[PDB]
Structure formats: structure tokens, C-alpha cells
Design a protein around this ligand. Sequence first.
Ligand SMILES: *[C@@H]1O[C@H](CO)[C@@H](O[C@@H]2O[C@H](CO)[C@@H](O[C@@H]3O[C@H](CO)[C@@H](O)[C@H](O)[C@@H]3O)[C@H](O)[C@H]2NC(C)=O)[C@H](O)[C@H]1NC(C)=O
Lengths: 545, 556
Amino acid sequence: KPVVNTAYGRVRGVRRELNNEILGPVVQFLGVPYATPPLGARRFQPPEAPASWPGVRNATTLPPACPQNLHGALPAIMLPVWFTDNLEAAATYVQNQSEDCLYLNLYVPTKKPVMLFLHGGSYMEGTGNMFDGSVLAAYGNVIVVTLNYRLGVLGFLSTGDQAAKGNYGLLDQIQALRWLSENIAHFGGDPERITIFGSGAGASCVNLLILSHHSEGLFQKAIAQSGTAISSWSVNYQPLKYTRLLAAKVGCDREDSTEAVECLRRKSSRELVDQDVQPARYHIAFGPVVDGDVVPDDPEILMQQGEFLNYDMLIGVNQGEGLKFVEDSAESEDGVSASAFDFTVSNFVDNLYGYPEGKDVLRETIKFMYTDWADRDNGEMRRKTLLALFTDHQWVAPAVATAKLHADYQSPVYFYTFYHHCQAEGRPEWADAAHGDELPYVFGVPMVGATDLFPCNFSKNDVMLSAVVMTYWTNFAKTGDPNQPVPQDTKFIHTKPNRFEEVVWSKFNSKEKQYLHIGLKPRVRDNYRANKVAFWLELVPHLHN
Amino acid sequence: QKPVVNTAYGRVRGVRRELNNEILGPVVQFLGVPYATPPLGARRFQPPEAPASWPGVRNATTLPPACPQNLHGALPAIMLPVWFTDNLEAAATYVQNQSEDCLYLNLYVPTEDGPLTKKDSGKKPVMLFLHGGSYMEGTGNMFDGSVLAAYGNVIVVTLNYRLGVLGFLSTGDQAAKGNYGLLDQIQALRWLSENIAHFGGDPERITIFGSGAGASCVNLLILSHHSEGLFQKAIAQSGTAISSWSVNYQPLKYTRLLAAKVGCDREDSTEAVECLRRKSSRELVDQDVQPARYHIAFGPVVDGDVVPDDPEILMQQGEFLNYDMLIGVNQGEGLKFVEDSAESEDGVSASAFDFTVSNFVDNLYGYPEGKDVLRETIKFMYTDWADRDNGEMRRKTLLALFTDHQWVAPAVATAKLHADYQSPVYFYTFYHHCQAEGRPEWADAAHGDELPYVFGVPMVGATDLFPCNFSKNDVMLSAVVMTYWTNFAKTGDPNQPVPQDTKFIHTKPNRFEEVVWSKFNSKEKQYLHIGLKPRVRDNYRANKVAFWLELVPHLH
Ligand SMILES: *[C@@H]1O[C@H](CO)[C@@H](O[C@@H]2O[C@H](CO)[C@@H](O[C@@H]3O[C@H](CO)[C@@H](O)[C@H](O)[C@@H]3O)[C@H](O)[C@H]2NC(C)=O)[C@H](O)[C@H]1NC(C)=O
């Protein structure tokens, strides 16, 4: 239980032996502060330095979660599938929760790299306590850092201008990054190799922070897993509409904008969060905002403007992310009918577009792009294309658009496609890697049993691939190149053909656009979902005017 | 030996000819027997009438004249079969002696049961061949149907029908309803149906077969009120009644421009036509009145008579009797499309591509307001997004664009309609050309490249318009296509009587003896893929077909 010198005082940890031989000992520094508790006047405002404690600290204990309501106001399309599948177990990590939750975890193995994991799923739920970064830290020989940041209703509320600028949850994350860039050295890690990695909403932040001038020499490498800043549910373009309703429900609905927020300074957080103010399908009620400050402009304008540092990037998507989209089709058998098809695709255009000629054309033309024709009477293979309609539109299209944009400014990008998943009954046979199914592998869960969340029988291959992705990820934190240093050796556990042995993960550039197909039989292919992307990226634009 | 079949108009005497092959038997030829009164007087722009009954013995000995055309001018080259334009020189030699008086067919009567061992009379199928590239040129005289007849044991018959101005000038009035050529083919049909049995033909098994323009006529005749008890099987090769150039919906427009040129343009339409009669067949045909791009100036017309409606409606409506079908397209029809920049040897410029696509939606569509969307979303379709780089790909797909639009899409559409109204349809796809001197080695099989095989050219050696090296391999494939076609005019089902057998060429396993060729229904669109490695697939060009047939009506 060692103590360590930080610029605000000293903290205690816990050495804990892993039951696995390949995994070493780790020191866990759970629940260290990075910003003074944002209560009262410190609410709805940017975080600063934390308390300076004169003595020591007992940081051997998990911090509380941020004010959130898991039962009700469910944005179930957005969330990682393992979340909604096991809401039961999910609620466990968010019981002890206070408005004081600006806290940081550190998983240290004993000038190492640092991997800051930005959790989430909707901007509104979640906690860093969810993901035990012990196994990642101990296998990759890297410092893994989970965190907590204010959540949506309380962390992302905004008025049309000044009274509430918004994005307090994002600022909470760069103040956990200001703390890392000054103090991680003392834990045994190089502060010039901090990498920020996230999935879903978490990845939307990774990608936003890149574009934010509020973080420059704070991190130098980024990993976006299944999420971007140009996605439909990325940034809140309607923050006034949803702030009004929230204020209207508690009684803080003043005509004056700046007096309404001062009312909101007074009402209890337990009450302030649990309101049931929900967004329009596929959008966010509370999240990131174009404020002209932390996020200077629309992420898309910002990207082409190209005023961001050339971070080392690792972007990717899963095969069938949008499982949730074709959920009402669990008891179908005949799959989805054309009647059900024409319907679903119609109010997909409705919910994401709405303007004339497109209204009729765009809807009919994309229908054509997602029917097979070679076999068009088959419901079960209409189901798949419906799933990939969403998947393509929400994750694939935006990721390749992103990877392409940064690669053009000579920021090195490595594109991954995750095609493998654990079965986990209560699941279709056609499932094949839904949104957020990559996490258990990135966090080496298949090594240390099956946790509360991911319960399924991890076969010896699930264990193998878990390592494979870990060495890839962790390599990237060091070099900014997943291939090196540690070669793809898996014969530590099973001397069976380590199937990623001699495959080289080539850089993803613009013209040629190579990616890594992560799965059972891995490859480097050249153009992922080539024409279905180009559809959304090139053609669909012209079908508005 | 010169036999003398006695017809219903006189007695005709034809030369016997020994064919240039060991295994092929002799064939009696009846050349230039008349099927109508010559359409000469106030008989121009009139339907053909039965021929004059002669008392003597007629000499079906020499080839007939060809109907008046001008092979050195009117250049719908885009719709002409590539073998024709490639050999204008040699092709012209066949129309060297023209006459307004030209209405004759030629017969090719076999003598054997097909191929031989080197070592009661039944009635034979008749296969009428509708020739023609643009409705303006040609003569059945170009196709020496002796081989086919002798190999397949069918009487192959070719004819001449009025082309161009003389065959198709219409006013849309009672003055000149037009469609004469078609009526000619029908008059030949009437002649065959009545007399062919005298030659030992089976009038119950007359089959018409065309290619390109002639294949349109095939389709038009299937749809025409006039064809009834005459024929009963149709083979449509690379031709269709619904292509941008199968029917002319602007007859008067071009009749007026023509009349204007010979000083016959009156306001009254009877007065204008009755004027044109007074002009020589020669001054009238070699005149230069060119049509809008990918259309015909003089051709078939919707006239409520021999073409009761717009063919596409007649089909949708099921306004046609049940005929056995054989419809097909060749892998790379519109090779002449990418000619404008074809042998540049770095492909076609992307910057040129979007231009050649915009001219496309202009010529065929542009109207234009929905042109905007339509053009941009036919670009996206024909751009391979794997490599938006190599122009070789862009050139291949620019060809494909044209191939799909002009030839395959309407063919698959005609297939789907007759099938659904329940005529049996056999769908073929031709993926093989003989390499003719002086054309690209990206030269997949172009438009009209099927002919040599159908007529068994590779069996008796190269000719002057089919002048390529025919391999032992090219011989087999012809034996295969002929023994399909003939097995069709025989039983309406290409895999009936005679089996697939090319053991008269060395024992390279006969690829086609494995394959049973399924009828084409509109749901599971099964087609035989004719080529070096045949197989039976379903849904040829699924996407691109559906693109033009489902999506594109919805895009304007
Ligand atoms: C249709 O063709 C026949 C021939 O196939 C033409 O009639 C033919 O006339 C010639 C001579 O007038 C005959 O040739 C023979 O010549 C030899 C040698 O000099 C002589 O010894 C024979 O006695 C005979 O004359 C030929 O046999 C004869 N054929 C007939 C009808 O018996 C006829 O001219 C052609 N019809 C037309 C359109 O004129």
C-alpha cells in the first residue's frame, strides 16, 4: 500500500496480485481528486484545481458516480448492447453517487505510457468504476486511467448563449487531463505519451477533444472506438429546446435566461437529473454544444479548417453495431417484410432528414441501395441490410469520413473493423459483433473470468483475441503504431497458430484506404463497405437541392 | 442438279450446292423467289400484295437485288453491328445492285439429317431471318444460311424487305401510316406459311429470328395484329421493341424534312406523299435526314394497325399471343459507345466521364429538371468505388452503362413480360467473341458478334465480313449455338431432340452437355450463360437492371 507525491499532497494505493501468471502485480489508486467538488456556485461552471490536503489520502476506495438515473429516460439505441442487456448488473456500479464525483482512478503496474479511458454511452449515464483497468495495465505494461465526469442533465446543460455555455462534462475531462499532464510522472509514467481512448459516446469525446483548442500538449495520441464528432447523436444542436423543458419541469422557467440558471443553482441534483426530458429519435437531450469556446464551431467546419494537432489516431467500427435498430425483429422468423422494410427506412429518412424532393427521392433511392435484388424476397437477409443501413449511416460513414480527414493532414491513422464477439445468450444467431462489444477484448476481460456485465462463456479463442487487440492497442499508446514494439505472439497461453503473427497493420491514408479486419481470420483489406460509404459521403449530399 | 419445287405461283428451279465441310451435306438453294408484287407504282408507301402467278418455270438460281439504301452516308453507326461498320467496304459489295423491285426471300433447303458419319420424308422447321442494323441498310443476301440448314436440318430462309424512306416513311396520317417493311416481313411470313410445305417445310414450325434492329422486328411482329397464324416462335438476339431506337415517335417530323429536300413538302399530307411517289427510289433514299441521337428518322411507327400501341403498353397489357421465345444480350454490346476516346491507352478521364454521362441523360432524358438528380445518381452507379482511379475501369463501366441501358435492361424487361403472360422464354447471355483483326484487347463480345456463330461461319471458314481466325474452339461453340437454336425451332426448347455433341472435333469434354437450360420466369430470372465456360445463373446484372427498371422511373 504505497504512498506517492502529487503537487497537492500524497495518496495511498493497493497492490493486488492477479491470479494469472502472465499478469503481474498492480497498484490501484482508486478515487483521487482532480477538481474541487462542483457544488452550489461551482455548478454549471468550468472545473479548477482540487483541494490541497495537508496530510495523506486513503485513495484505496472507489469514488462515487455522477448524478444519473438508469431506470427511465432510456436512450436504448445509443448504449453499448452489454449495458441494456444487463441493466440489472449495470445499476450496481452507480448506487453510491453524489454531486461530488470529479474523481480519477489510476491502475499502475510495478517512463510508462498513460491510457485515459473516457467512459459513457449516451453522455448521460456511466462511470469509470465500471471498467476494471487492472488486466489491461498488467498485460500491456501501461498505466490505465478511468475517470468520472459530470453527466448531461448536470454536466451538459446549456442556454442559447452566456448564462450557461455548456460542455461542463467535457471540461471535467480536460481537467482530468491537466492533472495527468502534471502528476502522472510521479506514478512512474511518461506524461508525453498520454493516449485517450473511448467507445460510443466516449469516442465522440475523444474525437471532440482533438478538435478542441482547450487541450494541446495534454495528450498526443487518440483512440476512437465506434464513435465520432460528426455522428447524428454526437453534439447537441438544440440545447435551448431541451433546457427549457428541464427548467419547465422543476419550476426554474424564467423569461430571463441568466435568472433561470441561477434558479437551477438552487434545486437538488437527485431531483434535477430525474426528469424524463427525452430527445427526438437519434439525437441528444443533453450533451456537447457548439459554444464557440471549448468547441469553437461545428465539428465538421472545424475539421476542414484543420487547426488541430496531428495526433496519432486509431479509429474503428464493429460489423453489426446497429443491432438495436432491428430489435422489434426478434420474434419475426420471416425476418422483416417489405411492408416492415419500407416503413422502417421511411421514418429513418423522416427522423434524420425532412426536405422536398429528397423527402420522396432520398427515401426511394436508399431503399434501392439496401435491397439485395439478387435475392429480394428473403426477410432474414433483409433484416441484415436494415441493420447495416443503420450501422453504415451512424458509425461506418462517419468514421471513414473522419479517418480520411485527419489522414489528409498527415495525422497517422490506423483503421480497424471488429468482426468477432462473444455469444452471450439472449442474442440472435446473426448478431455478429454489436455496438460496444469490442470493450471486453480491449479490457482483457476474457482473461480474468466473466465479469458482472459480460457474463458469457469465453472460449480459448476469445482469450487469444483479447490479448491480440491489447498488444495492438497498448503498442499504439507507446509508438502510435499498433504493430510495434511487441510482435503478435500469443503462444504464451496456447502455442496454436497465433493468427495475427505476420500480418502488418498498414496505415490508413486517403487514396488507398487500408484497414485491419479484426476477427477470427484477420486481414488487411483495401476499401471497407466501399460503395455504401461513398453513397452516404458522395451521392446523398446532392439529393437535397 | 437443279430441283423444281412447284409453288402456288409457279415452279421454281434452284441450284444444289456442296458445302465446304466433310460432315455437312449438300443444300438445294432457291434464290430470289418473289413474295410480293414489286412495290413500284402507286404501290410505294402501300402494303405489299400477293405476287403475280407466272405460267413458266422460274429461276431461283441467282441472288436478288437489294432494296435501295445508301451505305456511304446515313451513319447510325452506334446501332449498327460492329462487324458491319468495321467492314463497310466488304459489306457494300452485297448491296451493289439495288432496285425498288426487291421483295424476295431466299431458301436454303438441306438434304441430310444434319452432320454425317463419313460413311417417308418429314417436314422441316423453317427459320426466317430478319436482317437489319438500323432499318436503313442490309440485305438477307449477306447471310448464306446453307451451313445452318445443313447442320441443324431446318430450312433457313432469308429475305429483303423495304428499308429506310421507302420502307418506313410515315405521316401519321391516312396518307402514309408507314411500317411497310414490317408488312413485307409479314407478307413473306404469309408466303412461307402457304408454300413452304412444297419445299418440305413444316408451316406449323416457322420461327423468326433477328439480331439488333431485325430482332426489334421479331419483337414487333410478336406484338402486331397482322402476324397471327403465320409463325409461332421468335428468337430475339440483341434487339427489342422498347429500346430508344426500336420505334420512331416522330415520323412526320422526318417525313417533312425529307419531302423538303426533294421539293415535295406540302401542307396537305396526302398531297405531299402522292408527290414523293413521282421521285426515283435513288433520289429518295440517299438524302441525309439524320435522327436525334440514339433514335431513328425512318423506322417502325406506332400506327394502331400493325403496331396497335406503344410496344411497352401492349406488353404490360398482355396484348400479344403466346410465342416461344429466345431472348439474349452480348456481354459488351455498346462497344461503339466508348469509341470517342477508346484507344488512348490510359482509360477515360474522370473529367471526361461525367461529361459523357451528362450527354447521356441529355440525349435520352434531359427535360431536364429531374435531370440533375438522375445524372448524378447514374454516375455513382457506374463508378466503381474500389478504385476511382484507373480509367480502364471507367471505360469498362462507361461501356457497361450503355450496354445496360440500350440492350440488357429492355431485354430483361421484355423477358419478364412475355414470361408473366406465359409464353415460354429462354434467356441467353453471350460472353465470347472471335478476335477480329484490328480491335481492342478489352474487346469483350460487341453488338452483333453472335451472328457468325449462329450461322456456323466457323465451320466453313472465315468470310469477307466475318474475317477472323476461327479456332477449333470457335467451331465447337458455333456447333453448340446452332444445335441450341435449331433444337428450338424444332421443339421450342433448345435442349430438345439432338444432344450436344462436338465429337466431330477432338475430345475436349463438351462443356454444354452438363448444362440444362431452364426457362426464364420473372421471379427467379434463370438464363444460360453462353460462352467458353458455360453455366446456368439467375438474375443477370441484378443491381444495374433493377436500377434502370425500379429506381429510375422513381427518379424523374
Ligand atoms: C433458267 O436456267 C436454265 C438452265 O438451268 C436456262 O435454260 C437453259 O438454256 C440453256 C441454253 O439455252 C441450256 O443449256 C444447254 O446447253 C448445252 C450445251 O450447249 C446444250 O447441249 C443443251 O441442249 C442445253 O441447251 C439449259 O439446259 C436450259 N435449261 C432448260 C430450261 O432446259 C434458262 O435460261 C433460265 N431461265 C431464264 C430466266 O431464262
